[PDB]
Amino acid sequence: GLMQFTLPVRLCKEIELFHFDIGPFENMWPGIFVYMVHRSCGTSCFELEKLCRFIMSVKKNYRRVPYHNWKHAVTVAHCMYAILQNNHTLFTDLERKGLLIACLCHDLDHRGFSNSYLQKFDHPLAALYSTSTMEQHHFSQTVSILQLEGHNIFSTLSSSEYEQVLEIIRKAIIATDLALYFGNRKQLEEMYQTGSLNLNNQSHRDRVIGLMMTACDLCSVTKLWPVTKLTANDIYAEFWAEGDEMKKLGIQPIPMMDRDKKDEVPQGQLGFYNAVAIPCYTTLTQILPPTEPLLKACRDNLSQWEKVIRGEE
Ligand SMILES: Cn1cc(-c2ccccc2)nc1C#Cc1ccc2nc(C3CC3)c(CO)n2n1
Ligand SMILES: [Mg+2]
Ligand SMILES: [Zn+2]
């Protein structure tokens, strides 16, 4: 009832900042997430015994892959927490509630392979879900954990609030499909610039929550350089394993996934910052001005990749 979660001082302060790293102590990550729900949503959003049981089933359903693991789930939710705390009054009670959960769940049961590798391997999930294959699976796994006994953290919501919150979570998780990001950002750019962007238009809110989801999902490019650079090793560890598997199916993988083309990593990061990360955080900053630190941190890391190329590290 009167049972606040507290963090040591350095964490209590740094968790409010966009560039926070949740640290290497896995056993503190659930405490961090509950702390964020309590401050973002209130101590009354969720029955604590249910939330804790839900967090631990979510954790169990993430796998020990190098990048798309439980640490990423909690990192992406912390970024969403920072956006919600710096844009307090722009979001409904239900949006606050759905989005942190969506972020914790957005990569449930990921195997460390792209939608592309599933389709070329001809994985059962690719016939059940022809587009956003893994992302429809992540949502399906979320609804499964919600229907386990003692796990329905949304039990107190009305029939119709429950359905809105599962619909916010479904669109939030689908939007983490980066193939959908490009179109969704282009539309958001045009609506903002011609002045048509309207946050009372539910289809516009959808778009805006989708862009936040892409921003939170890519938030490793907004950390301090030593965090960003070591995360790149985890990311390439998956991409190269998928490369290996492509070659096993008789297919030349794209260079990004070819461990034989390691040399050209720095130049490939530039591509990614310019083609994906910078545009994402630019459009997000225009629509939500208090998210600017994400843009500035991204630009700092692009500039660190330029330095890697010029032999200066
Ligand atoms: C487009 N491309 C081409 C090549 C390439 C070409 C030739 C030889 C070697 C590599 N590499 C890339 C790349 C990338 C990439 C993709 C997703 C992603 N998410 C994140 C953080 C949010 C987690 C990072 C940053 O690490 N990334 N980075
Ligand atoms: Mg994903
Ligand atoms: Zn993700």
CATH number for the domain spanning 292: value is: 1.10.1300.10
Which residues, other chains included, contact 10 with Cβ-Cβ below 8 Å and sequence gap of 6+? none
Instruction: Specify whether the CB–CB gap between 85 and 132 falls below 8 A.
Output: no
Please provide the DSSP assignment of the chain as one string: --------HHHHHHTTSTT----S-GGGHHHHHHHHHHHHH-TTSS-HHHHHHHHHHHHHTS---SSSSHHHHHHHHHHHHHHHHHSGGGS-HHHHHHHHHHHHHTTTT--S--HHHHHHHT-HHHHH-SSSHHHHHHHHHHHHHHTSTT--TTTTS-HHHHHHHHHHHHHHHHHT-HHHHHHHHHHHHHHHHTT---TTSHHHHHHHHHHHHHHHHTGGGGS-HHHHHHHHHHHHHHHHHHHHHHHHTT----GGG-GGGGGGHHHHHHHHIIIIIHHHHHHHHHHSGGGHHHHHHHHHHHHHHHHHHTT--
CA of 1 to the centre of ligand 2 (A): 35
For helices 178-193 and 202-217, the axis angle rounded to 10 degrees is 130
Alpha-carbon span 165 to 12, nearest angstrom = 28
Domain that holds residue 126: 28-310
Q: Return d(Cα 12, Cα 219) in angstroms, integer.
A: 20
| HSE-up of residue 56 (Cα within 13 Å, Cβ side) | 10
110 is in an annotated binding site: no
Cβ proximity of 129 and 96 under 8 Å: no
* Cβ pair 18, 294 in contact under 8 A: yes
Q: What whole-number distance in Å separates Cα of residue 177 and Cα of residue 44?
A: 32
Q: Is residue 195 part of a domain?
A: yes
Which tokens belong to 196? Answer: 């048509």
Which residue is associated with the tokens 């297919």?
Answer: 251
Residue 171 lies in a domain: yes
Using CA atoms, how far apart are residues 46 and 49, in angstroms rounded to an integer?
9
Question: CA torsion 233→234→240→246, rounded to 10°?
Answer: -160
Q: Which amino acid would we find at residue 4?
A: Q
CA gap 72, 218 in Å, rounded: 10
Phi, psi of 21 (to 5 degrees): -110, 130
In a domain? residue 263: yes
260 annotated as ligand-binding: no
Q: How far apart are CA 245 and CA 248, in angstroms?
A: 5
Torsion, Cα of 124, 130, 135, 140 (10° steps): -60
7 within some domain: no
* CA of 262, closest atom in ligand 1: 9
Taking CB atoms and a 6 Å cutoff, what residues make up the pocket around ligand 1? 218, 220-221, 231-232, 235, 255-256, 261, 264-265, 268, 271-272
Quote the Cα angle for 25-79-60, to 5°. Answer: 45
The C-alpha atoms of residue 184 and residue 208 are separated, in whole angstroms, by: 9
CA 58/CA 108 separation, integer angstroms? 7
The token pair that represents 200 in the structure block: 């009372």
* Residues 270/309, Cβ–Cβ less than 8 Å: yes
Residue 193 forms part of a structural domain:
yes
The domain tally of the chain equals 1
Region of residue 131 (left: phi > 0; alpha: psi -120 to 50; beta: else): beta
Residue 130 counted as domain residue: yes
Indicate whether 21 belongs to any domain.
Answer: no
Q: Residue 68 catalytic?
A: yes
Residue 105 lies in a domain: yes
Query: Annotated binding residue at 119?
Result: no
